[PDB]
Amino acid sequence: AERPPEETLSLWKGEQARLKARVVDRDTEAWQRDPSFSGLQKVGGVDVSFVKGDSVRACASLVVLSYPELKVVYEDSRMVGLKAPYVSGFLAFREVPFLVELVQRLQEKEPDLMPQVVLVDGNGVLHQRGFGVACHLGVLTELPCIGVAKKLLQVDGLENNALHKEKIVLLQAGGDTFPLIGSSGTVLGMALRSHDHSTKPLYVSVGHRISLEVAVRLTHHCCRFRIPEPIRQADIRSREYIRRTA
């Protein structure tokens, strides 16, 4: 609706600190250590689309794609009732309850299509408190998650200034990257040029149960276009669903 009170934001900050202790930022799946991701068969994607004049109605979508073919083998799109407004740094408290429900519906409907990793539209550890939406989803479902954002969250000294734009120019081909280094000296994520015919990078960060280098490489392998195909197909299908109900 409208901006939540400081009371709520405080509880939200506190919940993010509690759950962060459960993030695993290294590889835990055998396919992640494989040079060609052998053993990876199913990649998930999630998105939530909203309506222009409607602050309460949204559409949440979960897709599972075959890998490496990137063919949609499962789709579930759902109209939902929004509770929280969008506040930067608290994106999870607006969308993640609906995404968790989608995962549980998949487990009940098609348990053999449970994805081995989820691409999440939004950051993971690249976040004001080191616990973005992709970490939040990963910890609540225990699935490996990757954060993929289209704009750079300005945290820990990260800035979309002239130097940052110089480096983006230096990205020349799909798969090129440069690291996002915080003022503490830690690597929060990578800027990734996802396709040869696109210049605007993706900003990839660890969600849960994956390393950054594997996350970046897998993100690149899913990009038929600029947006990785799992996120792209959830975006397309959730928006089409809004359109038919409007």
200: tokens are: 């605007």
Q: Which is nearer to Ca ion, 23 or 60 (CB)?
A: 60
Encoded one letter per residue, x for contact with Ca ion by CB under 5 A and - for no contact, window 62-101 reads ----------------------------------------
Nearest to 81 by CA among 60, 53, 52: 60
The answer to the question of whether 121 is labelled as a binding residue is yes
Q: Which is nearer to Ca ion, 121 or 229 (CB)?
A: 121
Please select the residue that binds Ca ion; options are 133, 145, 235, 241, rule is CB under 5 A.
Answer: 235
Residue 135 CB neighbours (<10 A): 33
The answer to the question of whether 47 is labelled as a binding residue is yes
Minimal distance, residue 149 CB to Ca ion, in Å:
10
Single-letter residue type at 240: E
Minimal distance, residue 46 CB to Ca ion, in Å:
8
End-to-end CA gap in the chain = 20
The one segment of 23-31, 86-94, 102-110, 120-128 that binds Ca ion by CB under 5 A: 120-128
* DSSP H stretches of helix in the chain: 6-20, 92-109, 133-141, 162-170, 212-221, 229-244
The one segment of 80-88, 161-169, 199-207, 228-236 that binds Ca ion by CB under 5 A: 228-236
Concatenated DSSP letters of 147-167 = EEESS----TT---SHHHHHH
Question: To 5 degrees, how large is the angle CA 226–CA 227–CA 228?
Answer: 115
The one segment of 11-19, 119-127, 188-196, 203-211 that binds Ca ion by CB under 5 A: 119-127
Residue 244 CB neighbours (<10 A): 6
> Cα separation of 63 and 44, whole Å?
6
> Does residue 176 touch Ca ion according to CB under 5 A?
no
Q: Which residues pair with 46 in a beta bridge?
A: 62, 120
Please select the residue that binds Ca ion; options are 76, 121, 176, 229, rule is CB under 5 A.
Answer: 121
Judged by CB under 5 A, the chain residues 22 through 61 that form the site for Ca ion are: 47
Q: Which is nearer to Ca ion, 121 or 176 (CB)?
A: 121
Q: Which residues bind Ca ion (CB under 5 A)?
A: 47, 121, 235
Binding residues for Mg(2+): 47, 121
